């Protein structure tokens, strides 16, 4: 279970005043992934019907 | 209408006798509405007739949602991406969960769309983006729509649901993010709520869900992986039904 | 006789007719294998409810067999007496020994 | 010295014009200025309130498995019980140093946006840094208030006032901490369940049980209930040697003593916002807080009928309370889920009660004295509550082998000699209650027939996890503290378990009683860590870190937090001290 | 209480009790308290030594 | 203002333990069980007042 | 300066979902004209 | 005239009706049990705490200021720390005229 | 007050009679929590005159 | 303490009560379980020797 | 299991030894001493319990 990627890698040195045609990054957390738990919606005890 | 139904013991005046109907109509002539209309958009002779007016709209949009979600997701999809967010090298293993995590969400989003009250649904973005489109078939209420939402189709308007834990709404405000193959995101112009600071689909533990005046909506996942939905092919709102809907939900701007 | 390995047998008439002297032995000498081909109409939680009215209403039976033993139930507290207009209603602390030879 | 050979004096009554302004409750800019540059998921055990779900019977095995993940993740915000003072003042070892800002408040990493009385598993992700409110002065952490300082204040209030005898507490402390404790004493308490009418029914049982157990251990017998001890005082105080009887009458007189220490420190001023002067001063007078064992319904009739009160949410079925006047065999529906609390406690069940109580105003305050203060003064951390399977309990209460006496025969007196006695080895089969009169030696005789006719009279269905919330009171309720919460969890039909006995299969581990830690004051280091079927991974987090199942309140959203509860399981100062000390730890802010 | 700086109690019965409770007789306690604009006008004792 | 400092002066918690200020800090009682003293450390130390 | 890894952003990067085939035979994907709610 | 000194206000009991034989009737601020008065059957629950540290006496029997013994002699008794031996003479000296 | 009625009810007629004003203001002579020099200072003893 | 102080002057020289009669009398006052047959005999004897 | 099988034998052995000596019997094994504290807490005099 790995998502597909077209290219492998690059390594870019980025000067701080020299950002031109700007881009952004992606944020992943610090804790290990056992803690980002499953999406849970339980059925309630009472129902509409 | 009480005593003609109380002395006759008619519990509901659609079970009123045909002479007992029209003799009241010979007395008071404004009752031809709630007795002789084929499908009135307001229900005749019920207490929650205004409430049952609302709950249909809560129903009829969810089928317009639910049969449109199946439409763009008919078979095995190719979604590749729509935004620009670059990775670190061990960050891809987070999406290794998002492969596994994925299909339980789309139930529980629609479960939560069921799970809200419709009175609490009209404060969300999809219930007003349709009103920005039913006014286009008029300024809807509370003026949450910005001055530049009615300019392009590139001005979307998002809601935010929690991905992990419980699948819960993480907004008060529809957060309207202007979207440009690829296209990078951009906010609009501008008492403190936590999640309202980020771009749509920018980070983990966020489901992003935007809509338009064109009513072609987005479902934005973290990592650029998003796709349009033609909900305009599934909104079946009859205009004489919808014209009592909009007038109760529009505001005449000066 | 109610069979303690099927919950579809416990009623209040079958347990109240049974004394509490004999309900000690009948619980420890049963069959350990719970059976599940005949459930209960009030639920399995309602079968425990039907068991305990069978024990509680049987407490009159174990007391009526000892009716030559204890005394009259004294009014434990005030407010339980007829004539109130000159003397009060007593409340008798029942710390005594209920026993008649 | 002044500008002479002159002396001057600066009191702390000097501090009247500075600490008393309504800016102590002005923390609007504080929460806003700390909010940006957010904090990550701080695995919010004590930083989240759960609404209750389902019965209380399985509620652990919910929360055991629900927090099986984000519990061994990191640590809770408090570690400072290990930290000495000025180790907090130093830049290392305290990342929470930049989170301690107000003397009257707390800034801690909680959940982001989910409204609190709802859900079970919060969405771990981004975090929020908000408030709670510091209620009483004891909530300050123990590197800022030294432990010896708490006893310093306590002893010096100890002078001039009534204290327990030094001999008599040894009886109580032996009783509280007795392992081989006769389990009728847990069962016969739930039998009376605080019903005064069932008490004066069963007074011979109450007479002999204390009389028998005194000869085994020089100790009190039934002592985890204030009501039950209160009833022993009045309706039983004749037929005992004084040496036994001194223990209970000293206990109440010390609760009499610890009661009127509030109002010697009070001023006559007007009634205010519904509350009285004393309610705004001390925590034991405010009726919105209620003890962990509430047998009647006097509390919520006081508590929910307040201007402070918001949504006492009892969550098994319907959230809002509607109550019972009396209760009997057909009324105690032993496993239900509605939230109806029983009023079946008074002497006059004929003159029944649903709206108008029988008790004085200090009655629950006396229980709040007896439960919140005195039991932690004997706990040192070791006591926890219990949720009652009254269906299992009322099976075995009315389960005795008391034979018929012969025509002309004597009274049963002794177990080992007399064959007609209920505790005789001829009358000992397992799974009956005179075997449980025999598992701990309690001489209870043939006239025990007087019990069961009233055991059939009054009974109680099962306990329930009542969650009352409230707003900050009149006097702390400014326009930035209006939205604040105080969650106060407690059980209705519940019993305290003093001595956790689980290294014994006599009561199998949680048959009658599922544990349910209702608060950090009653959090079983040996109850909960030895539960029914159980993860071994939490063994680290059980030896410390009091497991409060989050339906019953959180670490930060209550009146009593972690700083004082370690102070209970700390300094070896006397019983007279800690009683006054924890009381002095209960002065409002 | 010399100056206006804070949101008061919302329980207005409480704060007006505590109003004069603090500012009973301070040497720095005003009489006829704060108008909209202006100083608190700290009173003058009859003598200073 | 320049130094951002503040000098303590002759002060303690008991008039009993203030008695040992009129002999200098040679044998000044710093500390009884809680009763604490801080001797004068200032430019004003040792002076006329 | 700042030091991190880098991958070129292109529209040929796909994350793969699976389906259990009963996902659209759900109570909310298949809603009638009126609910019991 | 024909009165009797009640030592212990016992209201934690409905065996005798609370004040059945004996209506309470405080005669002076020396004699006002805080559980006698506040836990009488007809007592206003709006006046609970103010009853606790004020000796409620109907003014047909005497107020505070026209009694021969005022509040300070009362307040010495309930509040002083000393044992009864010293406490005896300490209030016994509290009766020398002015 | 004058001695009115029989002795059985004169307190019970009193608590109905004096319910209004006795809760209105706090009476003068409950000042036993006041200490020395809390009294002789002009605040907190409005009854100093 | 001052009102208790001159008691400790007068405490010498005169009769002091035994230690046993201190707690026996005081516990009898604080006996909540004090049997009420004793109150009616006190009204029965009614000063008549 | 075998402890409560012979628990009467454990009881008489201790107290008969308690009659001769003021000494405890089975302190040689904590697992035994865990049991007497747990199981035989009724049938012992308190002086050796």
Curated annotation (Swiss-Prot), chain B:
Subcellular location, record wording: Virion; Host nucleus
Record function comment: Capsid vertex-specific component that plays a role during viral DNA encapsidation, assuring correct genome cleavage and presumably stabilizing capsids that contain full-length viral genomes.
Family: Belongs to the herpesviridae CVC1 protein family.
Subunit structure comment from the entry: Interacts (via C-terminus) with capsid vertex component 2/CVC2.
Name the record gives this protein: Capsid vertex component 1
Swiss-Prot record, chain E:
Domain of life, source organism: Viruses
Compartment list: Virion; Host nucleus
Function field: Self-assembles to form an icosahedral capsid with a T=16 symmetry, about 200 nm in diameter, and consisting of 150 hexons and 12 pentons (total of 162 capsomers). Hexons form the edges and faces of the capsid and are each composed of six MCP molecules. In contrast, one penton is found at each of the 12 vertices. Eleven of the pentons are MCP pentamers, while the last vertex is occupied by the portal complex.
Subunit structure and binding partners: Homomultimer. Makes the hexons and eleven out of twelve pentons. Interacts with triplex proteins 1/TRX1 and 2/TRX2; adjacent capsomers are linked together in groups of three by triplexes, heterotrimeric complexes composed of one molecule of TRX1 and two molecules of TRX2. Interacts with scaffold protein; this interaction allows efficient MCP transport to the host nucleus. Interacts with capsid vertex component 2/CVC2. Interacts with the small capsomere-interacting protein/SCP.
Family: Belongs to the herpesviridae major capsid protein family.
Name used for this protein in its record: Major capsid protein
Coverage span on the entire protein: 1130 to 1178 of 1374
Swiss-Prot record, chain G:
Annotated compartments: Virion; Host nucleus
Cysteine pairings via disulfide bonds: none
Location of region: Interaction with major capsid protein/MCP: 1-37
Domain of life assignment: Viruses
Signal peptide: none
Function comment: Capsid vertex-specific component that plays a role during viral DNA encapsidation, assuring correct genome cleavage and presumably stabilizing capsids that contain full-length viral genomes. Participates in the interaction between the capsid and the tegument through interaction with the large tegument protein/LTP.
Quaternary structure, from the entry: Heterodimerizes with CVC1. Interacts with major capsid protein/MCP and triplex capsid protein 1/TRX1 at the pentamer vertices. Interacts with the large tegument protein/LTP.
Similarity remark: Belongs to the herpesviridae CVC2 protein family.
Protein name: Capsid vertex component 2
Taxonomic source organism: Human herpesvirus 2 (strain HG52)
Shown segment, full-protein numbering: 13 to 49 of 585
UniProtKB/Swiss-Prot annotation, chain J:
Annotated compartments: Virion; Host nucleus
Cystine pairings recorded for this chain: none
Domain of life per record: Viruses
Membrane-spanning ranges: none
Protein purpose: Self-assembles to form an icosahedral capsid with a T=16 symmetry, about 200 nm in diameter, and consisting of 150 hexons and 12 pentons (total of 162 capsomers). Hexons form the edges and faces of the capsid and are each composed of six MCP molecules. In contrast, one penton is found at each of the 12 vertices. Eleven of the pentons are MCP pentamers, while the last vertex is occupied by the portal complex.
Subunit structure comment from the entry: Homomultimer. Makes the hexons and eleven out of twelve pentons. Interacts with triplex proteins 1/TRX1 and 2/TRX2; adjacent capsomers are linked together in groups of three by triplexes, heterotrimeric complexes composed of one molecule of TRX1 and two molecules of TRX2. Interacts with scaffold protein; this interaction allows efficient MCP transport to the host nucleus. Interacts with capsid vertex component 2/CVC2. Interacts with the small capsomere-interacting protein/SCP.
Family the UniProt entry places it in: Belongs to the herpesviridae major capsid protein family.
Listed name of the protein: Major capsid protein
Species: Human herpesvirus 2 (strain HG52)
Lineage: Viruses, Duplodnaviria, Heunggongvirae, Peploviricota, Herviviricetes
Gene name of the record: MCP
Residues of the full protein shown: 590 to 638 of 1374
